[PDB]
């Protein structure tokens, strides 16, 4: 009755105009996943550079003498790719493609006194036995405090924190697809599994079963898993090809709501334009939901689920060409569709120039969007 | 919307009241009918197994300790059954609760007819009547039947009661309410727990005696019975001086009882 | 009948030991496939990004 | 609302092999099947009917019956309108057993939640053991309406709900 | 019979998708090497400009 989606909405009506405020480019390779600390002080990301950095939000808001990363961790070695902070900016867990998992306690610090990381409880999976992890999320069950994590041998393991013990594990059909994301019910009663190819597959967290497996009808994959913050049976999926952001009722299995931003017909199964939503941001707000998504086409797009002739482009220069949302009803579902309408020099394009493999948000003062790229370069937008 | 959390309980040595135990029914199928046994022991199809679907089973209820029976075992009335072995009775046993020893269990014999004066095992179960924590077994169990054995009082127990094991436990917890309801997501969980049910019921031939505990209640409480022993609150005055007396002896200033039995026999 | 009955029953037993042989087979197949998936996903990525 | 006037919820309550479920079944999708699955757990369903004028939305509930799956605590019966206590007119245990049945409804139901004695398999004549006098007068003598249903062919499966649901109705 | 059949086009697949992955790999790197090649022309241009 009473979990709330985020411990920091985003202010009412927030409509974000999409003012570069941090160009930080301090990864080598791609950058994979950003997460924000719950109490949003702390953000960090994690690359193929192997580094894991920790950037500080509150000094990205008006007095940005130096954007610089507080604190970078390499020492887990291989590609880390994925992180999540453990509910308190003290912990921070990210995992290696080598196959580790590491606890990494993040020090606040008095500015006389530098910051630091330091190791806690480690974790190596056997890449025969379990292979490496591909997604992991960490949530309170009130008496513990689980990092749930999906390994690429099916394993979506359950590790206690304040044990050393398995909470759980949940074998998942690698039948199904290899898992490249999944998504917690906020009410901690129920996960969705997004594989490979297009299957999203539900457990029952209380009775720790597998109870449902819808596949998309292009089998195409997951490349994102986000519950809901309005209907607990939902799941929001980002699909491979036309920037398809899909929603499904995991109870009945029926699409209900679909983003289209394709040069393809909606919906159509034929010939999908090769980009896809990396990461999505959806938040309740004020009632109406919104939902922010970047991705292959280098666009942060703003979708107003209530209002979806308001949706825009967040990132892109004015220059291409304008776009038009349309909400239509093809199978049955509502589909808010994206068509194309047909001082110095021009100013620098703010936008990525590579593939934005992520999307977050954290509320300091104002709320922030920050959207990572495949070269590296994390961006701030106020 | 809700009555407090308060735990009332009794010490186990201050209930002074018999134990009762109800037989409640016997779920599952027997060991068919095998006919090779029967050509080599003709008295064979003369046995509830190859007279009736449903022979008129009874059950003894025995408590052990140490491995010793406590007392005599008691059986179930006869009751009649046709299509369902459901006792439904409340056996009183011999035993009471301050009576009961931590490690006390109730070893539950199936038995049937085997010819004129034989009655042979249909099986055996036997559950500790304290939990982990040393309280008595509360409300509704179903004890695991281990088939054509006697129920086993030793300690440990060759018969335990106690992938549907898991679900059960969850799905008496949500029965009682101490999981969290969730219809959309029961609907289609419990459809997944029927089919291992019935899995099971095809895999193995297993049989499940249900039982139940009394309840104890005062003013609409619920009383738990946790095991203790009185004087269990008499922590030892122990103190480490021995300035003078160096060596302690128990017997020190108490009556000489090898003098008083010759004393008892000579005068 | 008792003799025949033994034949086909360790005929079904040993062909249904060779599905589980090849239900085991797959498994690893599942575990070896999902990994060289993973990496040509991986790589599909990083031929967009190049 | 514009979609229900009222949402009624029915449980169905019982010893195990009455036709909970296939009462269930035979209502809300108008199918039988003789492959017995054991209820666990909670099952419900949800029809909509008309009755007097008004748009009643019936989710029917379906609990195990089985006592290896049930308890004496019952969440169940909480926030139901109304309960059905199914019995086998062949089985005469489960008739005796609606004693029980009425005492865990009286303790765990509501204080006036509508009730109905169903005698499900009548079909089952030369089998019948429980006699419609002998489970009347029981009903009568506690004021539960009773009805003779038959899931296999859908005798006066309806009728039991479309009475129950009125029953409620007058009652709200 | 048709698990045999099953792991006869599984084992195909698993080879196509190794020697793919190689001709990703393959290009991938070849890509890099031009991608270098563009970056190191693009900053002499830069510095010239
Ligand atoms: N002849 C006849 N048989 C019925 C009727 N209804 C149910 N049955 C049979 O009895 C069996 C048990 O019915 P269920 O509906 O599964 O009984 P239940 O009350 O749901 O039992 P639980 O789910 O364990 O509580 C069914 O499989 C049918 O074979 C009926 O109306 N007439
Ligand atoms: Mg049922």
Known sequence: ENAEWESKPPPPGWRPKGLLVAHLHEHKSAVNRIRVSDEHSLFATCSNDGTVKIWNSQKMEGKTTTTRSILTYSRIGGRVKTLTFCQGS??????????????????????????????????????????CVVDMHHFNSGAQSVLAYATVNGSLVGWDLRSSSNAWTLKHDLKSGLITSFAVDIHQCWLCIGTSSGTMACWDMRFQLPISSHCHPSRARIRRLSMHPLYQSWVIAAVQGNNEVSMWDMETGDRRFT???????????????????????????????????????????????????????????????????????????????????????????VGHHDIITDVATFQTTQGFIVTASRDGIVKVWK | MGEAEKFHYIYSCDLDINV???????????????????????????????????????????????????????????????????????????????????NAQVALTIWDVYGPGKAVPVGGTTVSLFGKYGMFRQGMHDLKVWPNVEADGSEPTKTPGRQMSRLAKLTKAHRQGHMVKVDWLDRLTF??????????????????????????????????????????????????????????????????????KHHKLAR | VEKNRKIVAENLEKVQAEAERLDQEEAQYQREYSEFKRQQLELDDELKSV | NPEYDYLFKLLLIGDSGVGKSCLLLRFADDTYTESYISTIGVDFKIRTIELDGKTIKLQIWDTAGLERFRTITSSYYRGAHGIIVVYDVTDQESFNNVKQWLQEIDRYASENVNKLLVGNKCDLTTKKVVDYTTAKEFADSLGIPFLETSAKNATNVEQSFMTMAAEIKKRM | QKLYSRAQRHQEKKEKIQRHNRKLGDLVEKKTIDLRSHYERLANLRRSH
């Open chain 1, 90 to 131: 003290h912990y921070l867990a990210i995992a290696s493609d080598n196959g580790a998992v590491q606890l990494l306690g993040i020090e606040a610090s008095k500015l006389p006194k530098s910051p630091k990381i330091h190791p806690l409880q480690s974790r190596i999976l056997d890449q025969k036995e379990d292979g």
């Open chain 1, 259 to 349: 983003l289209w931003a394709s040069s393809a017909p909606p919906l159509s199964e034929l010939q999908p334009s090769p980009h896809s939503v990396h990461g999505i941001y959806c938040s309740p707000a004020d009632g109406n939901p919104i939902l922010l998504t970047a991705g292959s086409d280098m666009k942060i797009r703003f979708w107003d689920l209530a209002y979806p002739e308001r949706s825009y482009v967040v990132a892109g220069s004015t220059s291409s060409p304008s776009v038009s949302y349309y909400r239509k009803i093809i199978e049955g579902t509502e589909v808010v569709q994206e068509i194309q309408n047909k001082r110095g020099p021009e100013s620098l394009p």
């Open chain 2, 20 to 102: 009762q135990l109800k037989i409640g029914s016997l779920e599952g199928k027997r060991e068919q009918k095998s006919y090779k046994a029967v050509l080599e022991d003709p008295m064979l199809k003369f046995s509830g197994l190859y007279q009736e679907t449903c022979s008129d089973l009874y059950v003894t209820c025995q408590v052990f300790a140490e491995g010793k029976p406590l007392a005599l075992p008691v059986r179930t009335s006869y009751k009649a059954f046709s299509t369902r072995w459901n006792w439904n009775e409340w056996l009183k046993l011999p035993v009471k609760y301050p009576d009961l020893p931590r």
């Open chain 2, 191 to 260: 459809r997944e727990i029927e089919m291992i049910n019935e899995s099971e019921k095809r895999s193995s031939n297993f049989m499940y005696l249900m039982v139940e505990f009394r309840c104890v209640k005062c003013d609409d409480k619920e009383y738990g019975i946790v095991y203790y022993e009185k004087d269990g609150d008499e922590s030892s005055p122990i103190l480490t001086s021995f300035e003078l007396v160096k060596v302690p002896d128990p017997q020190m200033s108490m009556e000489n009882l090898v003098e008083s």
